[PDB]
């Protein structure tokens, strides 16, 4: 979400504004994304390597 206009963009922006129903994609579960959309339990384990 670009604070400038507090507009969520990208795959999150398709979900918050309802133009797409689901995002099955490499999307990292973070804190700011929790406030507007809800994730499932994370299907893939990854770490900084």
């Amino acid at each position: 979400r670009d604070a400038d206009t507090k507009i969520w963009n990208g795959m999150v922006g398709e979900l918050v504004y309802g133009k797409a129903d689901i995002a099955i994609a490499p999307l990292t579960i973070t804190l700011v994304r929790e406030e507007v959309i809800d994730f499932s339990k994370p299907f893939m384990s990854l770490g900084i390597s």
Binding site: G10, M11, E14, A20, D21, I22, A23, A25
Partner: peptide, 10 residues
Amino acid sequence: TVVVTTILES
């Protein structure tokens, strides 16, 4: 129908 959004990343 259900719309699946995703990014183009291999």
